[PDB]
């Protein structure tokens, strides 16, 4: 157990946080695409008006 316990735990904690952040960016990316499709739908509905 040469490696200091806090150092080893911080290593696993940062890897975990990096993974969580990557996943959150994927979520944001997918929401942006959905919000773009919602704006498209609103624009399509408005053009039906005279």
């Amino acid at each position: 157990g040469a490696m200091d316990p806090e150092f080893s735990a911080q290593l696993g904690a940062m890897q975990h946080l990096k993974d969580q952040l990557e996943q959150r960016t994927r979520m944001i990316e997918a929401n942006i695409h959905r919000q773009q499709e919602e704006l498209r739908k609103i624009q399509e509905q408005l053009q039906m008006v005279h």
Binding site: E6, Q10, A13, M14, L17, K18, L21, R24, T25, I28, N31, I32, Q35, E38, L39, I42, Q45, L46, M48, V49
Partner: protein, 57 residues
Amino acid sequence: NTLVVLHKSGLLEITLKTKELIRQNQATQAELDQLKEQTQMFIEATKSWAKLQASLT
């Protein structure tokens, strides 16, 4: 020294940027939801109305 390691690793900065982007994106979703409702109300009106008056008061 977790806050120090968070800072020196770059993940403090990235986590902060990501939280602010999530905030912005949630704000945009609220704007879209309100716009959806206003559009639907407007379209309904063109096909009935005084339901516009309630909003436009």
